[PDB]
Amino acid sequence: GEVRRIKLYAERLADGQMGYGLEKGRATIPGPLIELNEGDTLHIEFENTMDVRASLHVHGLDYEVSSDGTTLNKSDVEPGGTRTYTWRTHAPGRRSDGTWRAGSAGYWHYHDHVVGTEHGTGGIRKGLYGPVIVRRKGDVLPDATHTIVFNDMLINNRPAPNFEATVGDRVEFVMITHGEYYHTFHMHGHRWADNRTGMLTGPDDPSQVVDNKIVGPADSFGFQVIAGEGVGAGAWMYHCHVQSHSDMGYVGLFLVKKTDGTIPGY
Amino acid sequence: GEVRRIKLYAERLADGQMGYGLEKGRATIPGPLIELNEGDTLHIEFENTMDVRASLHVHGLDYEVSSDGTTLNKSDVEPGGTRTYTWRTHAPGRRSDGTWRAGSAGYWHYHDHVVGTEHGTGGIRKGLYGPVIVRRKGDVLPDATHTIVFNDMLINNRPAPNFEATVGDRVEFVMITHGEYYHTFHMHGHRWADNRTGMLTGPDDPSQVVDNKIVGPADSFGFQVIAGEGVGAGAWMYHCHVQSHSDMGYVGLFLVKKTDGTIPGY
Amino acid sequence: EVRRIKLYAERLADGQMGYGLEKGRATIPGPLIELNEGDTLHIEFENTMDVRASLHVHGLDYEVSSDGTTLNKSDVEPGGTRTYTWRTHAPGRRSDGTWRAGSAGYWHYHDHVVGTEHGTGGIRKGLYGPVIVRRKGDVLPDATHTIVFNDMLINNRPAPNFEATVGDRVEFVMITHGEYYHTFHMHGHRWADNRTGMLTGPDDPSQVVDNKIVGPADSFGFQVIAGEGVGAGAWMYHCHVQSHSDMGYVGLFLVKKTDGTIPGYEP
Ligand SMILES: [Cu+2]
Ligand SMILES: [Cu+2]
Ligand SMILES: [Cu+2]
Ligand SMILES: [Cu+2]
Ligand SMILES: [Cu+2]
Ligand SMILES: [Cu+2]
Numbered sequence: 036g037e038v039r040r041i042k043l044y045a046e047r048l049a050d051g052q053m054g055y056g057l058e059k060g061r062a063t064i065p066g067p068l069i070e071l072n073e074g075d076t077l078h079i080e081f082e083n084t085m086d087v088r089a090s091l092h093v094h095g096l097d098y099e100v101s102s103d104g105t106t107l108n109k110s111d112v113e114p115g116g117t118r119t120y121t122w123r124t125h126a127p128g129r130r131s132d133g134t135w136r137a138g139s140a141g142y143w144h145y146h147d148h149v150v151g152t153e154h155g156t157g158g159i160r161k162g163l164y165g166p167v168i169v170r171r172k173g174d175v176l177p178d179a180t181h182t183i184v185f186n187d188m189l190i191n192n193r194p195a196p197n198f199e200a201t202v203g204d205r206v207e208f209v210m211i212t213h214g215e216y217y218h219t220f221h222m223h224g225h226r227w228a229d230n231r232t233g234m235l236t237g238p239d240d241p242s243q244v245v246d247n248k249i250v251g252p253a254d255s256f257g258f259q260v261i262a263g264e265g266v267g268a269g270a271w272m273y274h275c276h277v278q279s280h281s282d283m284g285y286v287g288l289f290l291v292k293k294t295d296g297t298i299p300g301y
Numbered sequence: 302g303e304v305r306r307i308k309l310y311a312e313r314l315a316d317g318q319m320g321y322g323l324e325k326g327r328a329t330i331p332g333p334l335i336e337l338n339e340g341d342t343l344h345i346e347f348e349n350t351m352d353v354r355a356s357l358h359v360h361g362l363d364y365e366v367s368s369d370g371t372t373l374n375k376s377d378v379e380p381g382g383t384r385t386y387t388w389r390t391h392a393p394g395r396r397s398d399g400t401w402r403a404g405s406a407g408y409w410h411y412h413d414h415v416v417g418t419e420h421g422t423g424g425i426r427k428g429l430y431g432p433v434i435v436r437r438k439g440d441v442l443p444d445a446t447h448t449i450v451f452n453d454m455l456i457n458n459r460p461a462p463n464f465e466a467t468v469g470d471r472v473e474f475v476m477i478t479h480g481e482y483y484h485t486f487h488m489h490g491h492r493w494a495d496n497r498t499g500m501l502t503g504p505d506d507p508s509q510v511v512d513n514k515i516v517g518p519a520d521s522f523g524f525q526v527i528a529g530e531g532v533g534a535g536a537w538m539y540h541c542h543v544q545s546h547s548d549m550g551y552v553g554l555f556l557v558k559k560t561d562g563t564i565p566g567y
Numbered sequence: 568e569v570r571r572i573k574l575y576a577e578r579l580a581d582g583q584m585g586y587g588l589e590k591g592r593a594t595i596p597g598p599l600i601e602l603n604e605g606d607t608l609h610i611e612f613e614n615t616m617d618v619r620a621s622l623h624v625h626g627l628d629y630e631v632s633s634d635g636t637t638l639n640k641s642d643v644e645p646g647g648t649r650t651y652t653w654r655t656h657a658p659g660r661r662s663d664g665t666w667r668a669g670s671a672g673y674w675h676y677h678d679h680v681v682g683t684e685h686g687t688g689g690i691r692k693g694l695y696g697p698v699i700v701r702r703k704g705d706v707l708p709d710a711t712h713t714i715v716f717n718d719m720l721i722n723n724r725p726a727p728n729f730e731a732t733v734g735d736r737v738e739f740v741m742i743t744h745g746e747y748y749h750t751f752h753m754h755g756h757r758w759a760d761n762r763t764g765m766l767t768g769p770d771d772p773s774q775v776v777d778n779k780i781v782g783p784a785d786s787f788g789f790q791v792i793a794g795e796g797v798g799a800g801a802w803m804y805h806c807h808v809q810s811h812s813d814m815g816y817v818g819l820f821l822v823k824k825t826d827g828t829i830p831g832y833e834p
């Protein structure tokens with residue numbers, strides 16, 4: 036386990052948005068991907084560059100109330116303030132009561148808990164969210180990672196995103212939901228296991244294999260697929276499968292190229 | 302596996318409905334049950350008998366973009382048109398790199414993707430949906446299979462269905478959700494495993510045992526029960542457990558008869 | 568093995584409705600019923616109210632005569648009495664070579680006839696409670712706390728906190744009722760998405776979560792080591808649906824140090 040240190044900034048963005056960045060003027064929505072191995076400690080030197088209180092709160096990871104990011108625990112950040120947040124992670128192991136301590140590993144996320152309301156409704160709506168992956172020793176690592184956030188009726192706060200791969204690429208997706216509504220995440224031409232890694236461990240793994248998954252606010256899951264496995268290259272749509280949501284125009288493509296670089300035209 | 306051929310028709314029905322059928326004028330809502338073993342290939346000679354564009358799109362199974370059933374992938378069908386769709390399935394197994402490839406097996410479904418909207422909102426509403434089961438080698442086979450579809454506030458597009466069995470029958474249910482709303486599927490007197498087959502693989506399988514399940518649009522799961530196991534013969538209701546949904550009167554019965562043919566009075 | 572309890576449905580002073588083990592002792596949620604796989608429980612039920620009321624259970628083995636429905640003539644007339652029978656079974660091998668799933672799990676009981684023939688009125692007013700069925704060898708907790716998301720309410724409280732000490736094995740039963748989906752979230756803690764809410768071992772691939780989508784009549788549960796790797800503190804649990812959490816209904820898992828103290832918080 037390594038001790039890692041990063042800077043993070045909350046900033047107002049154009050069009051009434053808010054985002055996290057690794058550097059001032061570089062905030063994105065979603066925020067930057069944070070990747071740890073079980074046992075790693077992360078110190079986030081967080082600077083609130085905004086005129087409203089804001090925080091950093093994380094799902095899944097080990098933190099003390101001093102890093103809750105809540106009003107309740109006085110661990111949000113005043114306008115223009117700085118605070119060091121600490122996230123820890125642990126490997127699984129056998130407890131002295133004979134049980135198995137679940138590790139930190141999994142698909143997680145971070146978001147604001149104080150903009151607009153004491154639940155971060157305003158900050159989340161405006162873009163203060165980002166993905167976190169914690170890996171277990173011997174986890175299969177991907178060729179690329181893509182984050183898809185269903186935030187209210189938006190995808191990654193975009194106007195009313197595409198991801199490119201080549202056939203055979205090991206492609207990871209992080210899938211985070213925020214806001215008021217339930218959604219169903221669907222990907223054409225691909226499927227995954229409903230389990231920790233989104234991949235079956237082997238023949239003894241009875242997890243359902245799905246291409247559709249109901250998600251609600253602050254749900255996070257992830258998976259890896261082999262791009263075009265058994266289906267070939269093409270424009271592979273992903274969408275919410277709630278009919279009226281899918282009808283609002285937000286057509287995302289998983290663009291899987293043949294080895295020569297072509298996609299069967301669309 | 303085997304190479305199978307079938308014919309499928311989309312037809313308009315009474316009350317502005319649309320159904321799939323294996324023969325002209327035998328369209329049903331839900332559509333016909335398609336059952337495959339992992340490794341089997343299915344060629345569907347699909348005839349759109351209607352006066353609007355229609356398609357056939359499947360979840361879970363292997364298909365090329367030419368069988369996507371979408372306008373994006375030029376694989377919908379003109380009015381009066383014919384198109385051969387091809388569905389493939391695979392068995393699980395280790396890849397070259399030692400990772401486990403999940404099989405096709407599971408509870409799946411097909412539906413229209415181009416009637417009313419480019420997401421099949423009209424076609425789905427009007428009844429262009431059916432079940433698909435892909436079995437693994439050694440899977441327990443049932444005495445009967447019943448399909449229950451929560452389509453918006455309807456069950457199988459019926460106005461505001463019952464299924465008969467004898468005590469000890471192995472009864473399979475396929476549970477598909479479509480449209481706008483989340484639901485909770487509940488069955489009295491019976492329970493199942495929250496996993497691929499709906500049955501525990503044995504004593505190592507940690508899957509939750511449930512009688513109630515949250516489902517969203519395009520969710521599919523299924524399970525087998527022994528009819529009346531440890532509870533006896535009776536009128537065993539299944540219903541959505543969302544209180545306003547269940548109070549609308551959409552409440553079917555799982556009618557489990559004694560071997561003599563009687564049921565306790567209801 | 569064969570067990571009996573008394574249960575009463577009561578209109579509460581405030582117009583809510585609850586189950587109790589004794590007259591004028593009704594709670595919302597109702598009393599925790601705990602059974603071992605194989606156990607039979609006879610519930611001598613008395614509806615003390617001026618409206619028909621029932622007892623219906625998820626997950627456990629019961630005949631249609633204990634359905635607690637109008638359809639199966641097993642609701643109770645005002646002032647009436649009825650013995651409901653709940654059976655349970657261990658898992659085992661059927662002759663057909665298949666594995667019969669046992670009764671064990673996080674379950675619940677609720678009214679099926681107050682207001683409507685689906686208990687919409689009873690559930691709304693507080694006629695719900697938790698049932699735990701344990702398998703032989705299941706790990707037992709220092710305490711059990713029941714959290715019910717009932718429409719927009721938690722345990723029908725006005726617009727609940729649970730106290731533990733660091734290292735306590737604390738069990739939560741999480742039931743949902745009514746009209747809306749929700750997402751249950753607990754700060755500082757996580758559990759397995761499986762039967763027990765606890766990973767069996769390194770061979771259990773179950774997702775480890777701190778946030779779960781739940782709909783009406785869903786039940787799950789889990790055990791945590793209070794404050795494990797995170798320390799003493801006021802650990803909030805809440806719905807993560809943003810308009811739901813903003814309504815003010817937020818409970819605290821108050822994890823105290825062994826000297827009875829807690830880091831300062833501002834509720
Ligand atoms: Cu929170
Ligand atoms: Cu959606
Ligand atoms: Cu959160
Ligand atoms: Cu689609
Ligand atoms: Cu419903
Ligand atoms: Cu679909």
Ligand SMILES: [Cu+2]
Binds near residue numbers: 489538540
């Ligand atoms: Cu019911």
Ligand SMILES: [Cu+2]
Binds near residue numbers: 733734
């Ligand atoms: Cu301790």
Ligand SMILES: [Cu+2]
Binds near residue numbers: 807
């Ligand atoms: Cu809620």
Ligand SMILES: [Cu+2]
Binds near residue numbers: 487677784
């Ligand atoms: Cu119920």
